[PDB]
Design a binder for these strands. Structure first.
Ligand code: MG
Ligand code: MG
Ligand code: MG
Ligand code: MG
Lengths: 9, 5, 6
DNA sequence: CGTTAATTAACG
DNA sequence: CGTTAATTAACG
DNA sequence: CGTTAATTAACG
DNA sequence: GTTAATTAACG
DNA sequence: GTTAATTAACG
DNA sequence: CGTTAATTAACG
């Protein structure tokens, strides 16, 4: 169920 | 916390 | 599919 | 008529 | 704590 | 090989 | 709140 | 412009 | 803590 990558640090 | 998918 | 809010 | 390697956001 | 499958990077 | 401004998540 | 890497801005 | 996904809202 | 309302970032 994972979606899009989070914004990077 | 974050919503369950 | 969209991602996180901006 | 793009698959493999690497990454990461899901979970109970 | 830490695997899983989806996503993303890589190659081109 | 352009460089700084602005934004981002992580941390405990 | 602060840090440092990433991303956006600038023209 | 529409749709799926995320985020905000409600008490 | 449940559920729908409202928003917004996907596409091309
Ligand atoms: Mg080759
Ligand atoms: Mg100037
Ligand atoms: Mg397409
Ligand atoms: Mg289409």
């Amino acid at each position: 169920k994972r979606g899009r990558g989070r914004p990077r640090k | 916390g974050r919503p369950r998918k | 599919k969209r991602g996180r809010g901006r």
